[PDB]
Write an enzyme that holds these catalytic residues in place. Structure first.
Site, PDB file in Angstrom:
ATOM      1  N   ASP B  32      -0.753  -5.603   4.377  1.00 12.49           N
ATOM      2  CA  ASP B  32      -0.580  -4.786   3.188  1.00 12.49           C
ATOM      3  C   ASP B  32      -1.764  -3.933   2.764  1.00 12.49           C
ATOM      4  O   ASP B  32      -2.783  -4.435   2.280  1.00 12.49           O
ATOM      5  CB  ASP B  32      -0.142  -5.677   2.026  1.00 12.49           C
ATOM      6  CG  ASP B  32      -0.067  -4.928   0.708  1.00 12.49           C
ATOM      7  OD1 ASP B  32       0.452  -3.794   0.692  1.00 12.49           O
ATOM      8  OD2 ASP B  32      -0.515  -5.479  -0.318  1.00 12.49           O
ATOM      9  N   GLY B  85       3.539  -5.465  -7.575  1.00  3.88           N
ATOM     10  CA  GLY B  85       4.530  -4.622  -8.213  1.00  3.88           C
ATOM     11  C   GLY B  85       5.902  -5.249  -8.403  1.00  3.88           C
ATOM     12  O   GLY B  85       6.474  -5.192  -9.496  1.00  3.88           O
ATOM     13  N   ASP B  86       6.435  -5.850  -7.338  1.00  2.00           N
ATOM     14  CA  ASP B  86       7.753  -6.481  -7.377  1.00  2.00           C
ATOM     15  C   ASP B  86       7.811  -7.692  -8.308  1.00  2.00           C
ATOM     16  O   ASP B  86       8.843  -8.347  -8.419  1.00  2.00           O
ATOM     17  CB  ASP B  86       8.179  -6.886  -5.965  1.00  2.00           C
ATOM     18  CG  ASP B  86       7.213  -7.866  -5.323  1.00  2.00           C
ATOM     19  OD1 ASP B  86       7.358  -8.130  -4.115  1.00  2.00           O
ATOM     20  OD2 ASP B  86       6.314  -8.376  -6.026  1.00  2.00           O
ATOM     21  N   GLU B 192      -9.744   5.766  -6.571  1.00  2.00           N
ATOM     22  CA  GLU B 192     -10.906   4.967  -6.211  1.00  2.00           C
ATOM     23  C   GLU B 192     -10.497   3.532  -5.915  1.00  2.00           C
ATOM     24  O   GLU B 192     -11.243   2.805  -5.267  1.00  2.00           O
ATOM     25  CB  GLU B 192     -11.948   4.989  -7.335  1.00  2.00           C
ATOM     26  CG  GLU B 192     -12.728   6.303  -7.431  1.00  2.00           C
ATOM     27  CD  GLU B 192     -14.170   6.174  -6.951  1.00  2.00           C
ATOM     28  OE1 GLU B 192     -14.399   5.743  -5.796  1.00  2.00           O
ATOM     29  OE2 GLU B 192     -15.080   6.510  -7.739  1.00  2.00           O
ATOM     30  N   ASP B 218       1.959   3.064   1.071  1.00  2.00           N
ATOM     31  CA  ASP B 218       1.777   1.614   1.145  1.00  2.00           C
ATOM     32  C   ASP B 218       2.633   0.846   2.141  1.00  2.00           C
ATOM     33  O   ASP B 218       3.833   0.681   1.948  1.00  2.00           O
ATOM     34  CB  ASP B 218       1.980   1.067  -0.274  1.00  2.00           C
ATOM     35  CG  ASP B 218       1.874  -0.435  -0.360  1.00  2.00           C
ATOM     36  OD1 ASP B 218       1.315  -1.058   0.559  1.00  2.00           O
ATOM     37  OD2 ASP B 218       2.339  -0.990  -1.378  1.00  2.00           O
ATOM     38  N   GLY B 220       2.742  -2.126   2.527  1.00  2.00           N
ATOM     39  CA  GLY B 220       3.217  -3.315   1.851  1.00  2.00           C
ATOM     40  C   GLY B 220       4.401  -3.071   0.937  1.00  2.00           C
ATOM     41  O   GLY B 220       4.759  -3.945   0.152  1.00  2.00           O
ATOM     42  N   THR B 222       8.493  -1.985   0.900  1.00  2.00           N
ATOM     43  CA  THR B 222       9.671  -1.831   1.757  1.00  2.00           C
ATOM     44  C   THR B 222      10.257  -0.429   1.708  1.00  2.00           C
ATOM     45  O   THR B 222      10.395   0.245   2.736  1.00  2.00           O
ATOM     46  CB  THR B 222      10.817  -2.794   1.361  1.00  2.00           C
ATOM     47  OG1 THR B 222      10.328  -4.138   1.293  1.00  2.00           O
ATOM     48  CG2 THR B 222      11.943  -2.733   2.401  1.00  2.00           C
TER      49      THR B 222
END
Lengths: 6, 342
Positions: B32, B85-86, B192, B218, B220, B222
């Site tokens: 990730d 996040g998820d 950053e 990303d 990481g 889906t």
């Protein structure tokens, strides 16, 4: 599904 | 030398095999770029269910870590916490140990040994050092691989193979010049702490949709997400039909055969075109019969994100030290011609 970090 | 690491397509992410400890305990973890810390479930991890159907210890299904069997383990007596996040999370203790990947060894690699988590398994974060969930700066796998003399820079190339592919490849400190068409194009990293790039516009099936914003590339993640009006414009061009899930939340659907392309215009005149079909996913009734239409793998969010359904369409070289990301349309091949990232 997923969503990887705050 | 560049460390070629094999990626395993598990349908919602790409995992890699690493070893931990003096006994080289075998664990499989999610690669990730969207996080910066490596954490692996402890032999006695408490996997908490997040999805529906999560069996007993579903999160230690790819191995687990027991500091005790490692002659070289080292408890740092520091708690670790991280959220994603998820909504899933991970809680553990910071440790240091010998971490192995793709035939190489990283000594005194700090990472987290988790006792409670709702993630599918361990996660290998390789983002910016300033992205670490740790309350301080330390060397994550990338910077560590550089400091120890294995790779030239804290940088790596991501080659998510094709959607139907079984494996992909990520190269720490290298670039497989034979897996991307045309010439790589440099994009400055615009954050950053997050691996973000500038997105000028998005053209869906001929529809121009200005973005003039930043987007998170990303591995990481889906699927992909964008800002409200932007996502709605993409859904408009596609001709998606709004439906509701078992929770009464909005969901978009579209004919699986829906034609067209989604062209993401990045800076430095880099354009990556991804056929709309790559963003459509077919689900089935318990009867095995196909649903009337496919689900649009693009949802709205507060942040702009391009994940696996996008990246598989490109060769992505993340150069953290030089704060830049280079991309080019991908070329699917077993052939390889790897060079160091300078």
């Amino acid at each position: 599904x997923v969503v990887x970090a705050x | 030398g560049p460390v070629a690491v094999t990626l395993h397509n598990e349908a919602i992410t790409y995992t890699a095999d690493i070893t931990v400890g003096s006994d080289n305990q075998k664990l499989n973890v999610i690669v990730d770029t969207g996080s910066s810390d490596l954490w692996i479930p402890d032999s006695n991890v408490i996997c908490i269910p997040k999805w529906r159907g999560d069996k007993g210890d579903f999160c230690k299904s790819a191995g687990s870590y027991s500091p005790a069997s490692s002659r070289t383990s080292q408890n740092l007596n520091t708690r670790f916490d991280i959220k994603y996040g998820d909504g899933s999370y991970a809680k553990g203790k910071l440790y240091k140990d010998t971490v192995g990947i793709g035939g190489v060894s990283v000594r005194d690699q700090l990472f987290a040994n988790v006792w409670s988590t709702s993630a599918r398994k361990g996660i290998l974060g390789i983002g910016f050092q300033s992205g670490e969930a740790t309350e301080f700066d330390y060397d994550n796998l990338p910077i560590s691989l550089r400091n120890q003399g294995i790779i030239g820079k804290a940088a790596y190339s991501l080659y998510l193979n094709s959607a139907e592919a079984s494996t992909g490849q990520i190269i720490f400190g290298g670039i497989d010049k034979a897996k991307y068409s045309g010439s790589l194009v440099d994009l400055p990293i615009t954050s950053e702490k997050k691996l973000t790039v500038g997105l000028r516009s998005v053209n869906v099936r001929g529809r121009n949709v200005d973005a003039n914003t930043n987007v998170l590339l990303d591995s990481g993640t889906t699927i992909s997400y964008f800002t409200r009006s932007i996502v709605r414009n993409i859904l408009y061009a596609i001709g998606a039909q709004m439906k509701f899930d078992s929770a009464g939340n909005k969901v978009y659907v579209a004919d699986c055969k829906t034609s067209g392309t989604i062209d993401f215009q990045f800076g430095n005149n880099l354009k990556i075109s991804v056929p709309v079909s790559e963003f459509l996913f077919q689900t089935y009734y318990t009867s095995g019969k196909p649903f009337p239409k496919c689900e649009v793998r693009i949802r709205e969010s507060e942040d702009n994100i391009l994940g696996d359904n996008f990246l598989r369409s490109a060769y992505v070289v993340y150069n953290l030290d030089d704060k830049k990301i280079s991309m080019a349309p991908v070329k699917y091949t077993s052939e390889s011609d790897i060079v160091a990232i300078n």
